[PDB]
Amino acid sequence: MKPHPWFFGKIPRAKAEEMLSKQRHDGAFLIRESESAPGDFSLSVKFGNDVQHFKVLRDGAGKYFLWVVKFNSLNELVDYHRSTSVSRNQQIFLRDIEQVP
Amino acid sequence: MKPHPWFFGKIPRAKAEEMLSKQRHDGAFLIRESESAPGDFSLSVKFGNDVQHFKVLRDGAGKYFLWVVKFNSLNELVDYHRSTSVSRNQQIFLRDIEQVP
Numbered sequence: 087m088k089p090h091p092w093f094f095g096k097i098p099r100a101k102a103e104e105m106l107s108k109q110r111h112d113g114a115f116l117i118r119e120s121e122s123a124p125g126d127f128s129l130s131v132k133f134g135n136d137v138q139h140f141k142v143l144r145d146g147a148g149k150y151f152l153w154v155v156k157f158n159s160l161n162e163l164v165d166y167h168r169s170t171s172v173s174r175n176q177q178i179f180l181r182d183i184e185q186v187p
Numbered sequence: 188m189k190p191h192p193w194f195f196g197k198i199p200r201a202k203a204e205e206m207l208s209k210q211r212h213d214g215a216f217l218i219r220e221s222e223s224a225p226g227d228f229s230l231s232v233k234f235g236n237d238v239q240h241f242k243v244l245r246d247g248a249g250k251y252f253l254w255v256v257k258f259n260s261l262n263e264l265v266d267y268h269r270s271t272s273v274s275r276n277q278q279i280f281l282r283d284i285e286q287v288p
């Protein structure tokens with residue numbers, strides 16, 4: 087087992103945009119710990135010449151979700167959205183960013 | 188910026204012990220998403236011939252903590268405990284696991 091290449095911890099929202107702007111393929115993403123909402127996570131995803139940000143929402147039990155389907159972990163939320171679009175305006179599927187060697 | 192080498196997402200508690208048992212230095216650790224408590228995080232740390240597990244607790248606002256000092260992120264909690272012991276029985280400081288090439 088290896089650590090997940092998508093967890094960047096506490097990095098500025100702007101830093102996520104800077105990084106993902108350099109990614110070549112739509113869907114490139116990262117999970118970060120929100121600075122405006124301590125204790126909450128945010129998902130930043132590249133699409134075209136833009137970087138979209140999503141709030142990782144929680145239900146009453148602590149499960150995570152973006153829209154309707156929820157999961158017992160960020161890990162499962164992320165994997166589910168690799169084959170189900172994170173967007174309702176475009177078909178954008180999460181894919182690991184091109185990691186630096 | 189690079190992803191954090193300590194976030195393993197949803198892996199079994201037993202898997203964390205298996206991995207950390209192979210680590211050579213005390214303090215080697217990882218943050219995982221609890222399976223017994225969906226939505227909560229757990230910190231697993233190596234020390235001697237054992238692997239200790241800690242619940243990452245949350246206050247009313249969502250801040251994270253192990254004992255008393257709390258943080259706006261898992262990232263900050265982790266960094267704080269690199270220089271302040273996670274244990275009250277031994278001086279154990281978090282240190283990144285020896286990542287596989």
Ligand SMILES: CNC(=O)C[C@@H](Cc1ccc(OP(=O)(O)O)cc1)C(=O)N[C@H](C(=O)N[C@@H](CC(N)=O)C(N)=O)C(C)C
Pocket residue numbers: 099120121122123127128138139140141142143151152153173174
């Ligand atoms: C500064 N405000 C925004 O960026 C609007 C973000 C949601 C968001 C709100 C705040 C936020 O703050 P940070 O963590 O970046 O500091 C991060 C993300 C948003 O609305 N995103 C769109 C959206 O419709 N999101 C849904 C679904 C979701 N889970 O975010 C929503 N707003 O409930 C998405 C399709 C790009």
Ligand SMILES: CNC(=O)C[C@@H](Cc1ccc(OP(=O)(O)O)cc1)C(=O)N[C@H](C(=O)N[C@@H](CC(N)=O)C(N)=O)C(C)C
Pocket residue numbers: 200221222223224228229239240241242243244252253254274275
């Ligand atoms: C199965 N139960 C345990 O492993 C006892 C764990 C806390 C814990 C409890 C449940 C747990 O479940 P998982 O996420 O591993 O499935 C993971 C960790 C514990 O008590 N750990 C010690 C401890 O005293 N922890 C404190 C401080 C803390 N934040 O965990 C506590 N229990 O409040 C620590 C010094 C090794």
